[PDB]
Structure formats: C-alpha cells, structure tokens
Amino acid sequence: NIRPLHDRVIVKRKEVETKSAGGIVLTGSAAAKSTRGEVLAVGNGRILENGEVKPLDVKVGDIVIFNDGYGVKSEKIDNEEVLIMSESDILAIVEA
Amino acid sequence: NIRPLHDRVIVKRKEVETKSAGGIVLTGSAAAKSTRGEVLAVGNGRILENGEVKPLDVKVGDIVIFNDGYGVKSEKIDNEEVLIMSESDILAIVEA
Amino acid sequence: QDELDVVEGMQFDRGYLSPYFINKPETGAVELESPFILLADKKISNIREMLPVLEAVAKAGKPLLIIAEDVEGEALATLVVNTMRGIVKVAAVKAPGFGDRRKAMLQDIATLTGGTVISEEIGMELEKATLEDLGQAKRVVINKDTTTIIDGVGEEAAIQGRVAQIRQQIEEATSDYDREKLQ
Amino acid sequence: AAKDVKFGNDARVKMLRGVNVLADAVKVTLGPKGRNVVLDKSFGAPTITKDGVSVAREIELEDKFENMGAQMVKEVASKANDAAGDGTTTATVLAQAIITEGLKAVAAGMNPMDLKRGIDKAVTAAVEELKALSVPCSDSKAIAQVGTISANSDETVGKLIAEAMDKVGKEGVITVEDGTGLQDELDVVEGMQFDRGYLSPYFINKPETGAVELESPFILLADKKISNIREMLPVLEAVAKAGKPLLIIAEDVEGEALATLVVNTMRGIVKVAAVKAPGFGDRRKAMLQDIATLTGGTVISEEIGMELEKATLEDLGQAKRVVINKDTTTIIDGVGEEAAIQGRVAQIRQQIEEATSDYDREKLQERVAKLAGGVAVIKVGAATEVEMKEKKARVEDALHATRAAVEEGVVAGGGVALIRVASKLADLRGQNEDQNVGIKVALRAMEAPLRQIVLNCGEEPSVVANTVKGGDGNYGYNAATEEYGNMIDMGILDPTKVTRSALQYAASVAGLMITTECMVTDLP
C-alpha cells in the first residue's frame, strides 16, 4: 500500500475515452490522456505556517479532475500506473 | 455535477459575439473567445495561513469576467465546455 | 488496337489516401452506395473539426467521403479505425486540381452532389457542418489513381447554371490551357 | 539547324542503304551457325554478342539519311527485345526483307499506302495462322528444347532452365546473374526470402554457420521503427510466457530496445531476433502485409490503429522455421490460412495486370514468387568477363523464350513456321492490286528468316526454301546438321510469341518505312 505525504494525493488515472459522444472511436492523440482519475490515497494534510496539519478536502475513492504539468509525477504500484500530485493540482471532485 | 475546491470557480463561457454593435457579422478572430461567462459552480473558499477558509465573493449563476491564460483549465461535463479558474483570475461580476 | 475509354459524371485523377479504405479487396476499389460527401477547402490533420459531422453520419448510417486538400496522420488514422470498426464507412481522398482551380471544381462537385464546400473564406467551419451541408450521391468508386461519383444528388437547375457559368469562362478564356481545363 | 531534304527514290535508296547496313550487321548472327559481333565499348572491353538487339543498338551511321534508316529499323529489334526478349535478329531480318521487297514495288509505281495496307492485312492473317498453328508448350522436354535452341543449341542452358522452371513452378520468378565459377549454377529459394540480415551480430544461434535458427517461432511485424523497449514489452512478456522464439520485422530496431532484446537473447529468457523491414515506402507495407498473410499474423502500425502495447500473441505471426544470416532471411512454412494466401495472390496478380510499368510489375511478380512458389537465380559461369556477358545474354534469351513458350505456345523453328504460314496465306487478297502485291511481299519476306539461316549455314537459301515449301507440316531444315526432318521431333522449337512479335513489329515499321517519300535531316 502507498499513501502520500503533506497535501498530496495518489490518484489512478481513468481509462481514456476510446469512443466519442456519438459512437465515433477516437485513437491516438484523439484518445488524449484522461485528466480525470479516481483517488487511491489521501495524505495526512497540508502543513501551515503554525505547524498544524489541515486535512485535505479530497476523499479516498472519489473521482477527481487533475491538472498535468510539473506537479504530477508517475509511479508504478503493483504494476499499475498511478499519478502523484499536491491538492492544489487537484482541481475538483466529480459527483454523480 | 462538478464543484471546485479552495478559491476556484467553474464557469461556462458565454457565446462569442457573432454580431457587432451595428449588426456587422463578426467571424474568425473578430468573434474572439468571450471573457465573460456565467458561474456554474463556486468552491468552498480560499484557505488562509491560519487554517481558515474564507468564502468566495462570487455566487453560482452570476455572470463574471475571466482572464484567459495559465490559470484557466478546460473541461467537458455532459459534453459541454466549462472553464476552471481561481477566484483571483475571476475579474468582476456583471450586474444589470 | 484502338481502345475507347469513356467515363461519365465526376471522375478525377486522385486516389484514396490510405490502402485500408478498400471495401472490395478482390478489385482494390472502394464502393460506396448512396454516400455522404464532405467538401473541405482546408487540409485536415485533427479529428475535432468533422467530429460532429462524423457523429451525424454515424447516426444516419450512410457511408461518408471527404474531398479535402489533405487528410493525413491522426485524422486519417481515426477514419481508418472507424472504418474497420464499422460505425462509419468513411473514405477520404485528396482534392483534385491546384490553386484557383481546385476551389472551382470543388464547387462544381458541390453543385453536382447538392452540397456546399466548407471553407475559411465562405465562413462556416466543419464544427457546425451538418448532414444538409454535406453532398449526396448514389454511387461512388475509389481506386489507386481515379475517383468517380455516379449520379450526384444535385438540382438540375443548379447544374445548368454552373454549365452556363463555366461556358462563359470558356468564352472569356484566351489561353488554350485554361480553356481546355474549363472544357 | 539547317536541313537537307531528300525526295523520292534518292531518299529511299539512302534509307534502304542504312537499313541494309544495320540488318547486315544484325543478320550474321541468325541461326545456330550464325557468328558473333564485336561492339566497341568506350568504357571497358568490347562486347562479343550474338543477339541482334545489341548490334542494332550499336549501329549509327555517318550519313544522316542512312542513319535515319538505321534508327527506324533498329526500332524493330528494340521493340522485339522489349516485348518477347528473343527474335530480335529474326525481326530485323523480316523487317529488312519487307523494306527491300516493299521498296521494289514502290519503285514499280505501286501505291506505298496500299502496299502498307496489304502488308498489315497479310500480317494480321499471319498472326491468326500462327496462333492456329501453335501448340501449347507445358511439358518439360519441350521447354528444355526451347531453352536449348534459343541459347545457340546449348543443351546445358536449356536443361538448367527447364529444371529451374520445374522447381519454381509456373508462378516462380527466374533471373540471370553473374557467377563466380566456370559452370552454370542454379539457386532456388522457397517462401519469403527477403534480402535483409540481422541488425546485430550477436543473434547467431549457430556460430559455425553464422545463421540463426528458430524452430516454430513467433513473428512480430512492426511497420513503425522502434527505439524503446516499452512498446513490445507486453509482447516480450507474453512470448517469454509462451517460451517460443520471436523474430521482428521492423523498419529499424536500434539503441536501447535493440540492446535490451539482445541481452535477453543471451540470457535465455527469449530467443529473440530483429531484422529490418524489406523495401522502401509504398512497397514495404504491401509485402510486409504479404509476410503477415504468410505467417498468419497482422502488421502493427499507427495507420491500422492497434499499438505494440496492445499487441498480443494472436496478433503476431506464426511460422515453422526461420533462418537469419548476414545478408538475407528465410521463413519456412509460415502458418497462415491458405485461402488468404491465394486471395493475396489474386490481388497482387490484379495489381500486375493494372501495372503499366516494367519495374513495378516485376517487383509484384517477385512478391508473388516470394509468397507462393519459389525464386530461382541462375549464376552464369564463365572463365572470362566477355564470355560471362555472352553466356549471360544467351541464358537471358533462352529464359525469355521459355517464358514466351509457356505464355503462347511453340511452333517449328528455323523460320519454318513463317514458311507454313505464308503457304497457308496463298489465297489472301487485298482491296486492289497494290494491296495484293503488299501481301505477296509480306509472304515472300516471311521466308527471309529461313533463307538467312541457310545463308549463315553457307548453303543455298533458295534450294532449301523450295524444299521446305515442298514439304508439309513441321518438316523443315536442321541448320546445325544441315539435314531435313520434323523440327518438333528434331527439337527445334520457336516460341509463338517470339515469332509473332518479330513479324508484327517488323511489318509495322517496314510498312511505315516503305510508305515514305521525303526525308528531312540535319546537314553535315
């Protein structure tokens, strides 16, 4: 098991949409890497200037939208690709 | 449903002005991307250094003007384009 | 011996952009029965632009063909994949002719097939292109060298008006090369 | 520049003199007793040849009008070599005789256009009579006879070509190349035998031969070039689970992926090897797909859509044996569906029929021979370079004659087929007397190959021509033994395609050449 530290999240990236809205199959860069992913693990929380840890607003197992860039990192846990990013890189949580 | 986190807003961009002031049709670069858009979702609020969350001045369903750049992120929810920005990137609210 | 080779309707000297479009492997010729015809005045590299058009074609179910400056790379591969996936019978070929003539004979193809050419100058883009915008024909043949359209579904009045316009161009033309291209 | 213009009989005499120069150079080689011609080459040693097309090509005259005649009659041998590859000397002999006898009637006041029409009618009827007289040549004995006769009565060349066609079958491709020995060598290869070696020297499973042997190996076909081990890593793991060897046909395997796979090869996890893709663009894909059809697999590419990461064992091809070496690679008993193989054969044959270029068509035929049947290479063995060139030309002519024999059939050799055709066309008549005279000069010039054969033998052409015309059927003149008998029994056969093509091209150029009245050239 892997759990992150401080204000960071371990997220498994969702499967890329192979088919478009109206049944058209998209392949290649048309099947661009999905920025949505379910949360696999939530860290303890962000450390403020006073030394207090503020728990993250993201919960384990919740689908979230994440921003790719320098803040996201790639790792292989039990031969599965996961991404690591701070809660700032997490944009929003998808509900329903 | 999508709702954001921290000091950020989910905004649906308004349609580009196809017509000019005197009714001249504007196309291409003339019909540029609209900086105005209605707010679809407001986050909980900005977290300060003390650990307190200050609620955002923006409200759901209010038209606001946003600045395009690195702070805006594009996403598709129910096959509709929505932009994501921090409340700092949100410029002003259009009233009346 | 002397051989006579006659063709009818639109038949230009361009082939399919990928070998995988072939519906009839025993002849190497793609045969589209009552297909849709899209006329893109710009080259195609991405799949975003005609994605609403491709979805509308998939909803209709009829085969689809593209006449564009060049459909290549990612977009071409996407059409190929959707071709053996069977959702759409899509084939794309290079637009015939060259500058200031490719546009004219593309408009001629639009007049024959009852469609409209998608161009940046004309204003409408492929994103808002619909099934009504696309052209209509009864039969279409693709092979390595030529491309034929049989019974384009277009108005006879528009066809005759285009005939008159190009005949006026013939009469105004002075050089033999332009006049014979117009003929 | 300024032009010299000659009219009528003066221009005709000059043109006929040029034709006579070229045809007398060419026709000293006709028949088995015909001799060789030395052609001076500005680069290299002179070429000793017995084929009429090389002599015809090398003839160019100082007199411009005679040079016109030479070039026009050289077109006969050029076309006869392009179409059938044999009978260039016979075509030039026929063309010269039609021009000579045709200009006799032109000087006799008869209309040259009607003479040309009569020649065309007579030669159309002659082609019909040659087709009727032809017998199909499928047995190996007649093929050996055709190859022997076409190679200046060299029985070794004929028997070697017969054995080669027997080995590679009807769909096989046979080519002639130089050899390092003094003797003729036949090299027959089966299955896909593309000329690409291993990408690294360390793949060698059999160090005593330098050849990698793979027993029942998996085959992966990567249309794209790969430089990273990531893409076929699922495929590598799957084939390691299977344990069978793997061969990659790729555009290029280099760098990290190549190093990883050779390391895994000598670690023993996978007996893997990678080679370059055959050919270049627009031909690499088609015969890569042919390899996939032979091996029962599918090519991995971006255009087709699936990636190497998604490629599985079912995607990969299957074969029974694979041989890698320094220059080429052979695949033996590729496990593919027979019906798909024959469908691919039919598709490439349709491409051949649609092909209007000799290079593309010969590449397609080579691909057909690779996927189905075999490929034979005949190494011409000769102690010296000039003998190598002469023997290579003779074997090439024999190969073209055997190909024309299986294509169209065979007839009696030595010009007796044309003699029988002319005897059958005795009652043919044109629209007027000039056309009848043109028919008659065509029939008389049909005796020219036999007469020139007898002239090269040193005997009297007229006596032998009358003796052959007196006989019926395939009775003719053995020019090697200077005897008489059934030429089919005597083994002297000529391809019907060769004789018919020679007659047709000679007749066309000769008729258009006797129709002339004025000739306009550059002044000296």
Ligand SMILES: Nc1ncnc2c1ncn2[C@@H]1O[C@H](COP(=O)(O)OP(=O)(O)OP(=O)(O)O)[C@@H](O)[C@H]1O
């Ligand atoms: N032993 C033979 N007896 C009778 N005729 C023969 C004999 N050997 C060859 N011929 C004939 O000699 C003729 C000429 O053959 P040859 O190979 O010399 O030249 P070709 O067919 O005119 O063309 P090319 O010069 O291009 O090879 C053929 O028609 C062939 O039938």
Ligand SMILES: [K+]
């Ligand atoms: K000869």
Ligand SMILES: [Mg+2]
């Ligand atoms: Mg010969």
